Amino acid sequence: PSVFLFPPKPKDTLMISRTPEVTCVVVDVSHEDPEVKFNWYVDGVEVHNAKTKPREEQYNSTYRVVSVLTVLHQDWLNGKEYKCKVSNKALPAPIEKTISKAKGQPREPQVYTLPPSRDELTKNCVSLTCLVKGFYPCDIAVEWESNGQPENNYKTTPPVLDSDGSFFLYSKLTVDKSRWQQGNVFSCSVMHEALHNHYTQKSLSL
Amino acid sequence: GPSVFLFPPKPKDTLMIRRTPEVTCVVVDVSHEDPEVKFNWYVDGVEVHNAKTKPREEQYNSTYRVVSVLTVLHQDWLNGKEYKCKVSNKALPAPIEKTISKAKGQPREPQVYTLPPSRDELTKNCVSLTCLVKGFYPCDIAVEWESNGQPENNYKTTPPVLDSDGSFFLYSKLTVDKSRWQQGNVFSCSVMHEALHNHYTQKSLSLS
Ligand SMILES: *[C@@H]1O[C@H](CO[C@@H]2O[C@@H](C)[C@@H](O)[C@@H](O)[C@@H]2O)[C@@H](O[C@@H]2O[C@H](CO)[C@@H](O[C@@H]3O[C@H](CO[C@H]4O[C@H](CO)[C@@H](O)[C@H](O)[C@@H]4O[C@@H]4O[C@H](CO)[C@@H](O)[C@H](O)[C@H]4NC(C)=O)[C@@H](O)[C@H](O[C@H]4O[C@H](CO)[C@@H](O)[C@H](O)[C@@H]4O[C@@H]4O[C@H](CO)[C@@H](O)[C@H](O)[C@H]4NC(C)=O)[C@@H]3O)[C@H](O)[C@H]2NC(C)=O)[C@H](O)[C@H]1NC(C)=O
Numbered sequence: 488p489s490v491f492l493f494p495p496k497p498k499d500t501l502m503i504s505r506t507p508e509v510t511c512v513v514v515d516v517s518h519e520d521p522e523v524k525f526n527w528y529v530d531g532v533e534v535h536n537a538k539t540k541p542r543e544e545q546y547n548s549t550y551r552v553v554s555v556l557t558v559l560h561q562d563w564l565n566g567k568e569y570k571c572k573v574s575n576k577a578l579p580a581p582i583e584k585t586i587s588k589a590k591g592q593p594r595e596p597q598v599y600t601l602p603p604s605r606d607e608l609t610k611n612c613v614s615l616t617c618l619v620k621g622f623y624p625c626d627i628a629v630e631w632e633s634n635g636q637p638e639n640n641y642k643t644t645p646p647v648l649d650s651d652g653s654f655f656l657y658s659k660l661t662v663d664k665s666r667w668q669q670g671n672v673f674s675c676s677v678m679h680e681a682l683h684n685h686y687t688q689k690s691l692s693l
Numbered sequence: 694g695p696s697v698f699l700f701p702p703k704p705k706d707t708l709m710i711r712r713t714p715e716v717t718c719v720v721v722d723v724s725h726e727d728p729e730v731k732f733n734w735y736v737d738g739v740e741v742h743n744a745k746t747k748p749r750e751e752q753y754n755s756t757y758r759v760v761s762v763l764t765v766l767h768q769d770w771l772n773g774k775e776y777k778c779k780v781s782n783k784a785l786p787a788p789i790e791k792t793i794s795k796a797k798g799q800p801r802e803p804q805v806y807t808l809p810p811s812r813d814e815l816t817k818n819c820v821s822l823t824c825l826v827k828g829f830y831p832c833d834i835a836v837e838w839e840s841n842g843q844p845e846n847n848y849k850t851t852p853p854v855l856d857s858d859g860s861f862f863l864y865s866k867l868t869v870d871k872s873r874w875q876q877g878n879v880f881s882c883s884v885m886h887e888a889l890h891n892h893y894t895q896k897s898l899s900l901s
């Protein structure tokens with residue numbers, strides 16, 4: 488049995504209204520000796536907030552067991568380590584994994600909206616570009632909205648390490664050229680721990 | 694125990710006849726108990742024997758790492774031929790086969806758009822030059838920046854990202870002194886893709 492530990496989603500940790508969680512997924516759980524125990528420690532201190540989820544089956548006759556631990560927003564943002572100890576007798580080794588936020592000084596993201604190029608106006612749909620650069624850590628959330636209504640036809644590139652040690656990304660919202668030249672205003676909403684109120688908003692219009 | 698990893702040719706290699714594209718079959722975790730591994734190569738089923746196997750090099754973890762390199766024809770890879778590397782070892786319950794090929798599907802011509810720096814960014818000393826390449830298929834592509842026929846070499850390119858229409862898009866960002874951009878220098882975004890004429894195109898960008 489091999490374990491894969493996952494971090495909380497960036498949006499969950501930045502808004503107090505949401506609940507961030509650390510996901511500990513055991514993937515090679517076997518029918519024999521399926522007693523997969525879960526002990527959780529924050530900064531080495533055992534905590535009892537976890538809730539193991541029901542198992543799942545696959546096409547390779549292998550079970551999947553997941554334990555979900557709710558985490559405090561500041562605990563993750565302060566860098567505290569989370570250790571997922573998996574106690575299963577399927578294999579002798581008591582596999583243990585640790586997770587933590589990336590260490591280092593958070594750097595404020597820079598948000599620049601870029602209008603579509605003149606060459607793209609030939610096409611029936613144009614591309615609205617949102618450039619976010621100079622942020623650290625890579626944990627970030629980017630969304631698009633217009634008139635207080637979220638847009639859905641956007642894709643965000645994964646964060647990429649830059650020369651200066653910071654991260655950058657692009658978010659591309661694709662809309663009909665009619666909407667663009669009708670004068671509609673679109674906004675790129677960026678959430679990051681180094682932002683004031685963990686949120687900034689840049690607008691783009693004709 | 695032994696593990697096999699198959700690597701595709703670099704996108705620039707397959708797109709230029711001048712360069713030599715190749716497929717690398719890397720075997721790790723080769724113990725001294727059975728240090729001899731066999732590389733058998735197949736191309737769409739037919740067994741080929743122009744592969745050059747490198748001598749077994751032992752690593753510091755008492756594990757051997759053997760590598761075989763198969764030179765592939767540019768047209769063969771672009772016609773979707775499948776390259777299979779069969780690795781045989783006496784410490785293996787069964788010989789391990791790995792297959793690599795160009796992403797199956799219909800090629801899509803990339804659209805190249807150069808985007809000027811934001812006016813808000815002009816307050817800085819370094820400005821960002823953006824090259825949007827979208828609507829291409831498959832993933833294999835190369836993006837480079839140059840000015841005055843000389844590589845800029847101060848740019849970072851995002852990975853290809855699967856768009857909603859099934860194609861791929863990416864952004865390449867070139868960081869340049871705000872003095873150079875305002876000085877009037879013209880920079881060009883070079884994109885190499887199989888669905889491009891001569892597998893090459895250039896879109897330029899300058900203060901307008
Ligand atoms: C003993 O040591 C050796 C190495 O020794 C070395 O030298 C000695 C002297 C010491 O100093 C060592 O410290 C030193 O490391 C160990 O060999 C390693 O073994 C591991 C696995 O156990 C391999 O990991 C894999 O890596 C590949 C990528 O490898 C490229 O990038 C590496 C960057 O570090 C580079 O080192 C590699 O050489 C290789 O680089 C490429 O080389 C080719 C050669 O021609 C070149 O053309 C390329 O340009 C070049 N690229 C770059 C960027 O430089 C990685 O792909 C593997 O991940 C896949 O597999 C995982 C499961 O194995 C899986 O979890 C991943 O998600 C991923 O899964 C795959 O994903 C793809 C795409 O999504 C998908 O299509 C596949 O289906 C999927 N496959 C699956 C799921 O199976 C993996 O991480 C190391 O590369 C290897 N190091 C080497 C070969 O140098 C050896 O393991 C040690 N002994 C023991 C017992 O562990």
Ligand SMILES: *[C@@H]1O[C@H](CO[C@@H]2O[C@@H](C)[C@@H](O)[C@@H](O)[C@@H]2O)[C@@H](O[C@@H]2O[C@H](CO)[C@@H](O[C@@H]3O[C@H](CO[C@H]4O[C@H](CO)[C@@H](O[C@@H]5O[C@H](CO)[C@@H](O)[C@H](O)[C@H]5NC(C)=O)[C@H](O)[C@@H]4O)[C@@H](O)[C@H](O[C@H]4O[C@H](CO)[C@@H](O[C@@H]5O[C@H](CO)[C@@H](O)[C@H](O)[C@H]5NC(C)=O)[C@H](O)[C@@H]4O)[C@@H]3O)[C@H](O)[C@H]2NC(C)=O)[C@H](O)[C@H]1NC(C)=O
Pocket residue numbers: 489491493494510512514515545546547548549551
């Ligand atoms: C029986 O079948 C099961 C079902 O899976 C089948 O097989 C799969 C291959 C798929 O084809 C699937 O469709 C099939 O149904 C098997 O379970 C799977 O087993 C494999 C192999 O063990 C696991 O593969 C790993 O995946 C890791 C990523 O997780 C993936 O799954 C999750 C859940 O679906 C995806 O989504 C994530 O979900 C989280 C909640 O659980 C959520 O919180 C998170 O936000 C979300 N993320 C995203 C992006 O959506 C996720 O996207 C993946 O798809 C992957 O990381 C593994 O590769 C890496 O492994 C390590 C760990 O990252 C990495 O090394 C690390 O690098 C770091 C630097 O980057 C270092 O800092 C670390 O120190 C270092 N750690 C080390 C070295 O230990 C490696 O370099 C490598 O890159 C790996 O690919 C599957 O997760 C698992 N589950 C599923 C659903 O597929 C089962 O194994 C089978 N039985 C047997 C016996 O094999």
